[PDB]
């Protein structure tokens, strides 16, 4: 699993002694998140399942 | 302001201890920088360290070399640099992220405030 | 890494005159560019961010343009505060590098 937009803090602050952490800029360009399951490895593993149901 | 130690002079093998006091606060709130500066010739990063997550950054060079340190209740920054040369002579400065009002920047802006320097001559 | 060459290198002026620097990255930096100006001894001040924004306390004369990989500064009207050494910082990557300075001189 992976994000890869390249994000940057930038505290604010809110109060007395009290900071809120913002998100100040993406670097780059922006990419939608993700995860990879290896296909072959994962109808294998299915595959053992449903055989165990 | 963030003041630093006096100017000093070490041995080759030695090893130099900077610090760096930001009288003011803007501790928890912003990202500090070790950047030295070889005489008459540019800048060079050697390091970063955000307070408020505890997150170091050592440059890939003096990566093995130097370690830096946060102490919270006398809010002073220290850079210890172990394995001196006579090519490490320059003068070391402790930065500041920018910060726009109220926010602050903690992982990449310019450096808007600086310390004073520390002139660490090395002869050999 | 991110290498800065600083075209101008020690470039003459006099009082009241034109001075065109030149920062030229390595590889492109969108905006995230700024320029400092160091005084033999004090440390930098920064001057511009955004490789075009000024900062408060900095004159009218000084302008950043460029965009991409080739930046400049130009100090339109000189004054006798205004000859140090001016160096350029690329704060894309994760550690931000800086040039090699390009002092402007006296001699008329």
């Known amino acids: 699993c992976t994000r890869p937009n390249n994000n940057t803090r930038k505290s604010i602050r809110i109060g007395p002694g009290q900071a809120f952490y913002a998100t100040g800029d993406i670097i780059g360009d922006i990419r939608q998140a993700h995860c990879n399951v290896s296909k072959a490895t994962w109808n294998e593993t299915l595959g053992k399942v449903v055989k165990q149901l | 302001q963030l003041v630093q130690s006096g100017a000093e002079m070490k041995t080759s093998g030695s090893s130099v201890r900077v610090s760096c006091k930001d009288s003011?606060?803007?501790?928890?709130?912003?990202?500090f920088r070790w950047v030295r500066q070889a005489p008459g010739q540019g800048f060079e990063w050697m390091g970063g360290?955000?307070?408020?997550?505890?997150?170091?950054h050592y440059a890939p060079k003096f990566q093995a070399r130097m370690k830096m340190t946060v102490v919270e209740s006398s809010r002073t920054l220290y850079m210890e640099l172990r394995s001196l040369t006579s090519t490490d002579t320059a003068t070391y400065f402790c930065?500041?992220?920018?910060?726009?009002?109220?926010?602050?920047?903690?992982?990449?802006?310019?450096?808007?405030?600086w310390g004073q320097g520390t002139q660490v001559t090395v002869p050999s | 890494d991110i290498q800065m060459t600083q075209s101008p290198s020690t470039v003459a002026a006099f009082v009241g005159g034109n001075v065109t620097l030149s920062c030229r990255t390595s590889?492109?930096?969108?905006?995230?560019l700024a320029w400092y100006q160091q005084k033999p001894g004090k440390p930098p001040r920064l001057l511009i961010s955004?490789?075009?924004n000024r900062h408060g306390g900095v004159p009218a004369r000084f302008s950043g343009g460029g965009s991409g990989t080739i930046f400049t500064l130009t100090i339109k009207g000189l004054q006798s505060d205004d000859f140090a050494t001016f160096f350029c910082?690329?704060?894309?990557?994760?550690?931000?590098?800086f040039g090699q300075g390009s002092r402007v001189m006296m001699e008329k």
């Open positions: 930065a500041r992220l920018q910060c726009a009002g109220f926010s602050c920047e903690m992982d990449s802006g310019p450096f808007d405030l």
């Open positions: 003011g606060g803007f501790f928890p709130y912003a990202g």
């Open positions: 360290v955000i307070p408020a997550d505890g997150t170091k």
């Open positions: 590889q492109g930096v969108g905006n995230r």
């Open positions: 955004r490789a075009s």
């Open positions: 910082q690329q704060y894309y990557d994760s550690r931000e590098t």
